[PDB]
Amino acid sequence: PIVQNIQGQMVHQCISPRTLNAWVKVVEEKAFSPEVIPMFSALSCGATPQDLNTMLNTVGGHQAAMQMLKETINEEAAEWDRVHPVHAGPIAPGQMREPRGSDIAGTTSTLQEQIGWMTNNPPIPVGEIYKRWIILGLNKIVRMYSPTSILDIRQGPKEPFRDYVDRFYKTLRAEQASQEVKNAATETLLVQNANPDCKTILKALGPAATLEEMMTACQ
Amino acid sequence: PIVQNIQGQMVHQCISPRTLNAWVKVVEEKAFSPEVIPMFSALSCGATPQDLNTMLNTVGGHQAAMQMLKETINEEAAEWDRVHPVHAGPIAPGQMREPRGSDIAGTTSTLQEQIGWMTNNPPIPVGEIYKRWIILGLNKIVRMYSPTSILDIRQGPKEPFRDYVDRFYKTLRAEQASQEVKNAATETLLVQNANPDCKTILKALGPAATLEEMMTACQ
Amino acid sequence: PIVQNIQGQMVHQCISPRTLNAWVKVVEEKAFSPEVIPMFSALSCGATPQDLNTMLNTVGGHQAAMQMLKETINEEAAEWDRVHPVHAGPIAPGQMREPRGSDIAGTTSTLQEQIGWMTNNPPIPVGEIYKRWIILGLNKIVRMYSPTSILDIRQGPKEPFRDYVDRFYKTLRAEQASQEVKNAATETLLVQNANPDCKTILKALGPAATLEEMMTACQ
Amino acid sequence: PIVQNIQGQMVHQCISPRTLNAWVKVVEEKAFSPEVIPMFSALSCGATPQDLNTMLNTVGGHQAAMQMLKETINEEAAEWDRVHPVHAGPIAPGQMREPRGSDIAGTTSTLQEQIGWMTNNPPIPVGEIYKRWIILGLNKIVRMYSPTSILDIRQGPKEPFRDYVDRFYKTLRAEQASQEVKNAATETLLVQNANPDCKTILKALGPAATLEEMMTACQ
Amino acid sequence: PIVQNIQGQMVHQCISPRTLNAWVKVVEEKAFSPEVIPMFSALSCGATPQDLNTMLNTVGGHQAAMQMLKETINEEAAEWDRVHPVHAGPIAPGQMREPRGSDIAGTTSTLQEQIGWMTNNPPIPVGEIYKRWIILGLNKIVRMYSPTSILDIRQGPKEPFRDYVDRFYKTLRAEQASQEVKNAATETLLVQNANPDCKTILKALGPAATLEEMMTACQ
Amino acid sequence: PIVQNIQGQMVHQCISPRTLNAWVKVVEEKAFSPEVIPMFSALSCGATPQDLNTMLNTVGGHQAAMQMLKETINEEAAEWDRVHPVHAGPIAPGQMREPRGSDIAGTTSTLQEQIGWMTNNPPIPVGEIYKRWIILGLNKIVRMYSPTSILDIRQGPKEPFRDYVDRFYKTLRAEQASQEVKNAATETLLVQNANPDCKTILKALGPAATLEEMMTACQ
Amino acid sequence: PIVQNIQGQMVHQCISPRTLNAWVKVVEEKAFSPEVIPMFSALSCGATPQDLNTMLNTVGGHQAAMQMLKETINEEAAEWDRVHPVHAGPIAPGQMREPRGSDIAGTTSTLQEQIGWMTNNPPIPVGEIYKRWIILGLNKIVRMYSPTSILDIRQGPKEPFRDYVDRFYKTLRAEQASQEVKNAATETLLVQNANPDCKTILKALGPAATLEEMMTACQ
Amino acid sequence: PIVQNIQGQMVHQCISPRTLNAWVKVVEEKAFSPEVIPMFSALSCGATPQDLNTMLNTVGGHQAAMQMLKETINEEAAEWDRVHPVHAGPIAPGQMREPRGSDIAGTTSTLQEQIGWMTNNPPIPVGEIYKRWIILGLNKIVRMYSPTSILDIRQGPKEPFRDYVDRFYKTLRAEQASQEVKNAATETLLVQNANPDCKTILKALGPAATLEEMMTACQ
Amino acid sequence: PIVQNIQGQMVHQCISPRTLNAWVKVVEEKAFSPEVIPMFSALSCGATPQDLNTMLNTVGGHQAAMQMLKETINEEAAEWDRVHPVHAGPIAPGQMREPRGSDIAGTTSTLQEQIGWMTNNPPIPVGEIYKRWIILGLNKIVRMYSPTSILDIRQGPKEPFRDYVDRFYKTLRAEQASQEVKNAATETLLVQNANPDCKTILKALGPAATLEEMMTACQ
């Protein structure tokens, strides 16, 4: 990845064995839990598309999942070649060149072109545009690894209310719902899917109470 | 490997014990899975041919595999001595010298010659030419470690469709097929080798559907 | 070991606890496998003879093996005192001094003399001359730890041909044969010591075929 | 310990948690094997007497052994106060002061005095004088942890000759004999304490043969 | 001007008062002698077009000469806008922009654009393209300040031959003739325009003799 | 002035005695010639308004001229307080503050505020806004020091044409006319104010000829 | 010229106005005295051939002398193209190229080629080879500026002997005689060309006395 | 000269035009006054023998004086070849070499050898040994430029006593007498060569009074 | 002098030609005016005693004055050898040594000892102790160069009162009186030695008025 030294010149360093071993052991332990994506965004900090393709290629299993990631990048590369068309023929374009969809993806671009693109006065964040293509592709992977939906999450009879909300928001995080979708679930679905006793306890609280004073009610 | 310091002078550092222990423990755990090559390309970042020969020589087992790697490099060294012939006798060639096939391979070249070759204004990437000789040799190693072919990958009766595509593209990655070869398999071989029920479900989708909306069909 | 900083001045650093723990744990796991030597040459990168003697002295077991290493260095130190004789009496030799066989070995030389010898404009690689004395001594150690010779390596009846070549070149690497010795074994000993069936399959290939197309024949 | 930076100014760094954990785990695994001393000399590289006293004080067990180390340092501190007497009264000695036996040992000296003493143009190696007091004290510790003497090391009837020389020089290293003492043992004690068969094989070799051609004789 | 620091980053420094006072005092002493141009090329080393326009604007007199320099730059700026046309409309050209003829001349370009243009991986030498426009304009200025032509340079009767060749090549340097034009003058015009006596002395030398053995002839 | 170091941090240096002596000796030699302004813009490169007020205050004579410069800055400071009004009361504005007209002029601002204003991520060029106030004030000073107008510049009878164009554009530079004003003078006033003989020579050239081929005509 | 920074990287700096003004004012004061060459060798320290050609081109007068310098360089450039012939056609010579006689002279070589040539591991001192061509050419210039020969240097009747030896060795330095030529003059020409009185005083000293005890004799 | 940078590595810089112009203008103003030597020792601070020979070669006049300096160095070079003889033949002396008398003098040594000699751990101060040869040679030059001896320095009748002691010690400094020689002159020659009146005033002071209370006596 | 670099290590630089030429030209213009001492203290900032002796030795004239400076230093060196006696014999004093009176004066101390003495943790300011010996010696020199005493300073009849106080305090500064001595002169000698008219004007002011309201009274 590109790093900032003491001076501020964006020099290029190679990916460490610590970062390589960290990303591989996340996927081996947890397959495609929703917290893997937050981890990916942190291990690949300022990474070149050569370094971003290295982290995807070192994953051993989940080859059905990595084909969805490969088809999503090919959809975004074709979208980038449509929204950003070529101006004219490169008769006098210099050594630099406007990146296509296959140059941001690291397929038709060398390492020296990717280091230059990110260091331009007006930096072309090809390491950041390609990261949003993987993350949008990783959100589709973790959506099919969700074992259940939010409509099937109901509280057990001997299950405490802290374990039910733990299962409720773990399923809601797996379906990758938005803030507006999650706001409707915490006011119209969390109370109604509880046990009858706790549910009543929660209908007496009022129309909308925060979860800090809710869970304590059913302690 | 050569590293870039704060100034930008390509100084030479030695290979760390972290990088030495990382490459050895990859080969011990997974023998010659196709993800070992992506790992190799990452641990040997800007490595001199002395450092590239060190990583090949620290592998304990798989001496049948390392002899294929040794014969592939000797084929590429003889090819480099044919496509890049000697101009004339080195009467006044200076301290520098045009590298042969045995100097890129690190056999007849010292460490001081390899550091110089890579630091020349027009750098002679002898650490990168030799890396493509190992990677081309490593692709032949992982092709013979594939336990089965793509024609023998069929879906089981109780096997879910996510596990069948996991086995299908793990075998396809082991045979190291190209993008054109893999494009024919995902449109004429993935559907036809499934279970009858799922296969029908997939023939009703149309001529060519993406895998994101395919696997979900047979959920 | 001497390291190169950002400026290029060969400053002296101490051996890290990572490098100390790496070299000790190699010898504990594998005793004197032929890949230990390649590892030694990598952990002791630019090491002073004080640092090279530290790595030999931290090995707990194999005291029969370390006495062979001690007698080999004493043979090379006496050889260095014969091929490099003293010119005259050091009446005005300055603070520097031409190293003897016992100064390269780190016995009669201080640390400040060894740092100076390696930093001279014409560097006296006393850390590299002494490393070739250990490596020549380590090759004699791993030759007596070979459990069998190459004439006793024969293919089993149910043994696959990939496992036979794995055992053949592991024994050949343990005896430390040269390239000319190994070239005669791969054309006159590898085929003849196989199983009858495979051997025939290999006599029909021709006089000399490469191992990439050979092993596949007996797949 | 004092380290050398890029410029060459001997700045003071603190002992790392890696170096602290390395020295403690050596003593926990192997109690006082003779290879612990070589390890100590490597982990405490350029260490101040504050840092040298820290490594001795973090050892949990072997309090009988650490009292021998404490009494040996007190013997060397009293010896240093005799061989290096005070010149006169320090009426105008400046901020610096000639170190006593209790200032090299780190008992009556602060950290700022020990950093100064080592950085003087004529450096007073108080971190190196105190290290020879511990190492001389550690040699007395490992001499009493030797389980047997060299006169009780005899070859077993079914014991191979490689295992007998392994036991012979491990006991000889535990008694910390000199080179002249070890030269008499390898010519008058190694052969005579072997099995009768091997011993004869070794008397036919001649008066004095090297161990490389000896052990092979009794292979 | 842009300068190279210790690291190699092309930082921008301001023009020194030493460089400002040097260029002004050249023009005050010698008006437009042909050696002023060589001086200009040396004082403006790596100068931005803001810094190149500063050196032209600090010249007090010779406003007839500076209008020829202004009209020559306007001719080269219109030529640059013809040989380097605009590719298309700058809908998505980024912060950078292809320089026109009025941006290299420093008229329609800010200082931050000129520093960027010269620091691009493929540097656009706008400080060097504009310098060739001034130097081509300065050659037209010094051609009209020549007080005489080469056909009017004849040797005086009491004038020594060293002073005649001094006047001959000072006039030839003022007319800014090429190497092919000067080669015809030194073989067909230098001898024939001398005094009769010296001329004869030079016709006896042969067809073409070098000036080192010629001037000595007429000493 | 603020300077850029090797790292790129805009540190503050003091004005050198070389720069102080350079600016004073320009005004002493030439009073308010139009080339003084170009010099001022070069000596005050990246200067703080404290440093810009220092250069104006070290001028000994021309106190009638410096009062015009003081009244012009007070006009621009009142204009800046009108075009850039205060948003609201600074209840929570932090340590930084939006500069008024008297803070850019260096009257009500300290040195620490001016260094901060220029170093902000979005730098407030208070050293550059104040420089345009002096330069606009200096253009009014040099307009009243012009000894004659352009209508009184006529060619003398024995005056050569190179000296007439020297006097014509020195007067035109003193009146500070624009490019459109100077374009009308070089096509309708330069020819008509010459000597009759030269004028005719110039009417035969055509409607509009460049000065390079014009002055030569009247050589 | 190339300078060595703190790190040791041979960065390129421009020639200072101090060095430009120093070399010009030497030639203006003393025309071609023999001490100008020693000065030239000192002002042009590590100078590129672009910088060496700049110092020759800023000399105003002595155009007869600068044509001898131009013809001497053309003789050495043709000699360099004969003693260093081209090996073969540059089909694959890289970005670097073996310098011809016109590339060392700075005629057909750019600045970027000259900086590279001097920075090569085996540096091609093109700034030092070209300096010996100027210095050999400058020795021919100062030989023709000698006003008299050594045979015409005789002591005057009222001239003291210190002034005669001052005139004797100033003429001998102007003719650029070698050490063997000057050794014959100080033993067979210095005594015989003196005044009769002093000469006798010097014949009584003996065959060969040093000048320290000679001049004192004739005090 | 060799300079010490921020790190402490003795890099080589070239002699500045300021130092070159300073040493030349000392000799032009004052010919060989005794204060020129102190100046020389200060301008040539850490100078290489190439740089020391440059300062001697840029002196225009005094060629009788520079021949005494040349003969003194040749006497010291022959003395150095006698007191420091060659040990043996340089069969294996490395790149470094023990300097002769002609290598310290800068005649048979290159610049790269002189930089190395001074940077050796045990630095061979060839720039300091050669400086003592010039200074010993410069003391012989200034001894013959003394216009009078100390026996001819007598006080005039109207001359004040401050001007007589000014002339007395200027002549004593020109003859380069030692401290023991000058101690005898200030007690037996200063008083006796004064005017009768002052002399008496000084005989009444006593046997030996300091000059601070002496000159005041004759105020 | 010792300078502080960016890091803070007190490296040793040589005295510049600017500092050498500054100190010499002060003494040539003004002989021993009282402002020369303040200048000396500023040019010799952190100077070693080698550098302090260089500045005293480059003074051409005033050899009567420099002998007073030499005798004052010899008085202070003998005083330093009495107030700071030797403790005992230097049997084990190390490389460092307590400085005597002749080592601070730079007579019996090398440059390497003086750099060390000033860099000690407890720095021995030998460059500052020796500076107070010169300054105490320079105060005795400027006391004898005073042309008149304070009792002979009387106001002339047509002399204005500003010129009388200018002459009064220039003589008082030449006699180097203390603050208590100068306080008695400004209250009992300044008024009484004026002209009668002004004196009366000053007796009407009162007992003691400041000089700001005094000189104005006699305007």
Author numbering:
A (entry chain L), B (entry chain K), C (entry chain J), D (entry chain I), E (entry chain F), F (entry chain D), ...: 1 to 219
Question: From the publication, what sentences describe this entry?
Answer:
We developed an affinity-grid method employing monodispersed single particle streptavidin on a lipid monolayer to enhance particle absorption on the grid surface and alleviate sample exposure to the air-water interface. Here we generated streptavidin affinity grids with monodispersed single particle streptavidin (mspSA) on lipid monolayers, which allowed for high-resolution structure determination of challenging samples. Affinity grids could alleviate both issues by enriching the particles on to the grid and keeping them away from the AWI. Taken together, we developed mspSA affinity method which enabled the structure determination of archaea MCM and in complex with dsDNA, HIV-1 CA Di-hexamer and ScPol II EC, while providing essential insights into DNA replication initiation.
The HIV-1 CA protein is a critical structural component of the virion and facilitates essential life cycle processes through interactions with host cell factors. Previous studies of the cross-linked CA Di-hexamer (CA A14C/E45C/W184A/M185A) have reported a significant issue with angular distribution. The biotinylated CA Di-hexamers were subsequently attached to the mspSA affinity grid or prepared on a holey carbon grid as a control. During data processing, numerous particles exhibited evenly distributed 2D projection views when prepared using the mspSA affinity grid. However, the majority of the particles on the holy carbon grid exhibited a top view of the CA Di-hexamer. In both samples, particles displayed stacked CA Di-hexamers. A 3.14 Å structure of the stacked CA Di-hexamer was successfully reconstructed for the sample on the mspSA affinity grid. However, due to the pronounced angular distribution problem, we were unable to reconstruct the structure of CA on the holy carbon grid.
